């Protein structure tokens, strides 16, 4: 189980943060990742962080306005949205996965490179900016 | 307390229903109102039902696409939505209020009309429509 948490509204230029908590602990070769859907759509990856290291990958669309960060403790980590518009409306999957080795943690960034998701958190960010 | 379900994203022109069950049995005065609220707007009267006789009464921006239904069995209600569209986008809140003696159900239009209140659901619209 990949526990989900933190869905809402905001308004375009809003930030919101998401949270995905895992039932079992991480190790050391534990990946994160987030995807999104809106209706009619593909899930489309959005970033991901490598549990050891916390080194983290974006895709182009959310690079340097949203972070990924790892909270050891609750066994969580957070994906923190910035500067959000209308078209990262969607809902959001956190996913984990066990790197393989001779891999790159950054070329996780596919749905099947994923066996493990959780149940998805609606974001909604209206037109109306702040 | 007023639970509610149903929240989720759908398609442009799809159809989806929120549910409300009250804790309490009704009785022939409980009356049930919907209101949605997106952020940058007010919160906004949908539409309510009478227990006592199915009497239902609209927002002028969803009659003819939303059908709210009595659940007797459940103690609850139903707000059917169709033709949706990303103007109805919002998060929809369910309300309860006991009808004072005077005035019609119909009249239970207003957000202080409505001292129970639900917790919210999320609903949106895609821009994206159906392929059928």
């Known amino acids: 189980?990949?526990?989900?948490?933190?869905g809402g509204?905001?308004?375009?230029?809003?930030?919101?943060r998401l949270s995905?908590?895992?039932?079992?602990?991480?190790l050391s070769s534990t990946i994160?990742?987030?995807?999104?859907?809106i209706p009619g759509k593909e899930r489309?990856?959005?970033?991901?962080?490598?549990?050891?290291?916390?080194?983290?990958?974006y895709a182009d669309?959310?690079?340097?306005?949203?972070?990924?960060?790892?909270?050891?403790?609750?066994?969580?980590?957070?994906?923190?949205?910035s500067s959000l518009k209308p078209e990262d409306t969607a809902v959001y999957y956190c996913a984990s996965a066990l790197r393989r080795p001779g891999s790159d943690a950054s070329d996780y960034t596919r749905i099947p490179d994923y066996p493990y998701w959780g149940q998805g958190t609606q974001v909604t960010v209206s037109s109306h900016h702040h």
């Open 1 to 6: 189980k990949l526990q989900q948490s933190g």
């Open 9 to 16: 509204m905001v308004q375009t230029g809003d930030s919101l």
């Open 20 to 26: 995905c908590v895992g039932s079992r602990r991480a």
């Open 32 to 37: 994160v990742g987030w995807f999104r859907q």
């Open 44 to 57: 489309e990856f959005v970033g991901g962080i490598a549990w050891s290291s916390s080194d983290t990958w």
């Open 61 to 81: 669309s959310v690079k340097g306005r949203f972070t990924i960060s790892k909270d050891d403790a609750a066994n969580g980590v957070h994906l923190q949205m």
